[PDB]
Amino acid sequence: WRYGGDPPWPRVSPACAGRFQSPVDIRPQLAAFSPALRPLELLGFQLPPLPELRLRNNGHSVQLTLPPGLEMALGPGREYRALQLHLHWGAAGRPGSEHTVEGHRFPAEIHVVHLSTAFARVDEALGRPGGLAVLAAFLEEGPEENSAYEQLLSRLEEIAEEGSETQVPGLDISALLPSDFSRYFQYEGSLTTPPCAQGVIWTVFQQTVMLSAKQLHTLSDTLWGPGDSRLQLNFRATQPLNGRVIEASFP
Amino acid sequence: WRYGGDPPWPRVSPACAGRFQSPVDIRPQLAAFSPALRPLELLGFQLPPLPELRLRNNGHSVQLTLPPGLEMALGPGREYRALQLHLHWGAAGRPGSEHTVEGHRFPAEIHVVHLSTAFARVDEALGRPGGLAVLAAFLEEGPEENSAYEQLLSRLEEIAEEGSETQVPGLDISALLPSDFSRYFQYEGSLTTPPCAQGVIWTVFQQTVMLSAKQLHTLSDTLWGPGDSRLQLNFRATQPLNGRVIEASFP
Ligand SMILES: NS(=O)(=O)c1ccc2c(c1)S(=O)(=O)N(CCc1ccccc1)C2=O
Ligand SMILES: NS(=O)(=O)c1ccc2c(c1)S(=O)(=O)N(CCc1ccccc1)C2=O
Ligand SMILES: [Zn+2]
Ligand SMILES: [Zn+2]
């Protein structure tokens, strides 16, 4: 399966033709303020240098496999553990976030994918209500260099080849996300790649993260994908809400 | 395990000493209004007279087994199938609802227990978030005989003996429930008896249903429980929220 060309995603996976898919356009006017949405809580995200983490060019994104012991609660009794993170980006002068806000696509996006503690393995969680949870944050151009991201971005040249991987030292994974864990959008959707299973809880931070222009250029310019083509515009088409309401943790 | 007497439930089921147990005390002022909570959808509940339904005295409640095809939705793509219903009640001069509202215990309470359609079996759903869903309504005293309830109450004498069961004609299950399906409380808790599995979505109707004094009496005074004892006061003490915010579908 590719972004751009065949084969169609319903052929690969029947769930990619579900009604309740991701990503979506967030329209903050229409979001339902939901005071039950408490600040997100992360434990175990400040990793030491060892053991190292596998960072892989899988042809569709760059993905960092996360170790055991990274705990994330969406709220009391809604407990998850982090599996992996990866990135969606565009090209030169072209945005590549997956979610949009009032139609606005941001330069790039980070996803931290999590498994409910009620499930041992992802294949039991797929399609199950709240079985997976993704924390999503937009990345935007800023004046300073983001040092948290530099740790990863400086290693992309090593994994330029599609299907290549490298080991990188542990870092503060939470420093790859906004500092504000209290202001966010939440909706139920899907994985954005086959098998596109539904039952996924998406939490999209209102605060963005800032990368420098070069940092964003490193991301979008370094990696290679299927064929003899660049790994760029690695975002799925926005999907209709189809009557889902997006909640907001804030008024 | 028994109602109102040892062994203490965490010795039977350590699950019963979980942090996120049911029932709870609902305090409407502290409930969070969540506008994304849409009206409950219940299709297939208007059953014809045949086939008949199993109604059992199991010593803990009276339980009606529901056939396939009672479909219920809590939200878009969040669907369920009804499995069974049962009641909780007190005794002469004493209310026996499970949930409470600002401390008020109501005469009785109906529970309609459902299984997420994302799970083929109940046993897969136990302990999984949103795997089971219960619709709860309070029953209070009112002036009129309730004719929906009369179909069950009038059959209790035939199953007075613990462990005895009877077949009853199909009835309209939706008629046992309150008027306004748009107005309810919602939180995540547990089964209210061992095994006290968590991940249960509880939806408690704001509005009640009314039964005559003679009907409540018939419910509390007809059935026999374990040993040589009266099946009465079959409710669980309310449980702390432990950070859980009860949500309300209405301002
Ligand atoms: N772009 S994204 O954030 O939504 C995303 C998209 C797809 C997938 C994942 C995340 S995944 O959960 O790691 N994952 C798990 C891999 C897996 C699939 C089946 C069985 C076992 C593991 C995905 O497929
Ligand atoms: N007060 S109440 O609504 O919350 C309630 C209490 C106890 C139980 C159920 C509901 S149950 O889900 O049918 N159930 C099912 C048990 C079961 C487990 C595996 C297979 C089949 C049934 C219960 O024990
Ligand atoms: Zn993604
Ligand atoms: Zn019950």
Q: Give the number of whichever ligand sits closest to the CA of residue B88.
A: 4
Distance CA(B96)–CA(B116), nearest Å, equals 28
Q: List the determination method.
A: X-ray
The C-alpha angle A8, A139, A248, rounded to 5 degrees, equals 85
CB-based contact A76 B242, cutoff 8 Å? yes
Find out whether A193 is annotated in a ligand binding site.
yes
Atom of ligand 2 at shortest range from CA of B132? 12
Other CB atoms within 10 A of residue B202 CB = 25
Distance CA(A231)–CA(A89), nearest Å, equals 9
Give residue ranges with CB within 6 A of ligand 1: A 83-84, 111, 113, 122-123, 132, 134, 191-193
Find out whether A104 is annotated in a ligand binding site.
no
Distance CA(B91)–CA(B210), nearest Å, equals 17
Two tokens at B124? 């897969």
Beta strands in A19-77 (DSSP E): 25-26, 32-33, 41-43, 53-57, 62-65, 71-75
**Cα→Cα distances B201→A209, B179, B197, Å:** 35, 21, 11
For residue B190, give the H/E element and its range. Answer: strand B184-190
Other CB atoms within 10 A of residue B76 CB = 17
Are A150 and A119 in contact by the 8 Å Cβ rule? The answer is no
Q: Give the number of whichever ligand sits closest to the CA of residue A88.
A: 3
* Nearest beta carbon to residue A34 from set B32, B119, B130: B32
Pure H helices in chain A: 9-12, 122-125, 147-153, 213-222
Cβ within 8 Å of residue A64, ≥6 positions away: A53, A54, A55, A56, A84, A85, A86, A152, A168
Q: Per-residue DSSP letters for A155-220?
A: TGGGG-STT-EEEE---BGGGGS-S--SSEEEEEEE-SSTT--EEEEEEEESS-EEE-HHHHHHHH
Distance CA(A181)–CA(A249), nearest Å, equals 10
CB-based contact A36 B75, cutoff 8 Å? no
Atom of ligand 2 at shortest range from CA of B200? 4
Nearest-neighbour CA in chain A from B247: distance (Å): 7
Please name which of B4, B6, B11, B5 lies closest in space to residue B195, comparing C-alpha atoms: B11
- Active site annotation includes B60: yes
* Nearest beta carbon to residue B76 from set A35, A128, A242: A242
Distance CA(A190)–CA(A201), nearest Å, equals 8
What is the distance in A from the centroid of ligand 3 to the CA of A151? 20
What is the distance in A from the centroid of ligand 1 to the CA of B55? 45
Are A205 and A176 in contact by the 8 Å Cβ rule? The answer is no
Cβ within 8 Å of residue A120, ≥6 positions away: none
- Cis, peptide link before residue B14, omega less than 30° from 0: no
**Cα→Cα distances B152→A67, B85, B98, B155, Å:** 55, 11, 20, 5
B96 burial type by CB count under 10 A (0-12 exposed, 13-18 middle, 19+ buried): buried
What is the distance in A from the centroid of ligand 1 to the CA of A191? 6
Largest CA distance in chain B: 49
Distance CA(A45)–CA(A72), nearest Å, equals 9
Please name which of B13, B22, B16 lies closest in space to residue B202, comparing C-alpha atoms: B22
Other CB atoms within 10 A of residue B103 CB = 9
**Cα→Cα distances B51→B43, B65, B171, B181, Å:** 18, 12, 10, 27
Size of chain B in residues:
251
Distance CA(A45)–CA(B148), nearest Å, equals 55
Pure H helices in A20-108: none
Specify the 3-state DSSP secondary structure of B69: coil
Q: HSE (CB half, 13 Å, CA atoms) of A127? A: 15
Which residue in chain B is spatially nearest to A34 when comparing CA positions? Answer: B34
Please name which of B27, B18, B56 lies closest in space to residue B198, comparing C-alpha atoms: B18
Phi, psi dihedrals of residue A88, rounded to the nearest 5°: -125, 130
- Residue B14 region by backbone torsions, left for phi larger than 0, else alpha for psi between -120 and 50, else beta: alpha
B194-197 — which CB contacts under 8 Å span 24+ positions? Answer: B194/B1, B194/B9, B194/B12, B194/B13, B194/B15, B194/B16, B195/B13, B195/B15, B195/B16, B195/B126, B196/B9, B196/B13, B196/B15, B196/B16, B196/B18, B196/B21, B197/B15, B197/B126, B197/B127, B197/B132
**Cα→Cα distances A138→A144, A177, A203, A205, Å:** 16, 9, 12, 8
What is the distance in A from the centroid of ligand 1 to the CA of A54? 16
Q: Per CB distance under 8 Å, which residues of A are interface residues toward B?
A: 18-20, 32-36, 38, 75-78, 116, 118-119, 127-131, 188, 198-199, 242-247
Place of tokens 């969406």: A74
Which residue in chain A is spatially nearest to B126 when comparing CA positions? Answer: A118
Distance CA(B135)–CA(B201), nearest Å, equals 9
Chain A residues closer than 8 Å to B32 by CB? 34-36
Chain B residues closer than 8 Å to A131 by CB? 128-129
- Cis, peptide link before residue A226, omega less than 30° from 0: no
Q: HSE (CB half, 13 Å, CA atoms) of A36? A: 26
Other CB atoms within 10 A of residue B14 CB = 12
Are A100 and A169 in contact by the 8 Å Cβ rule? The answer is no
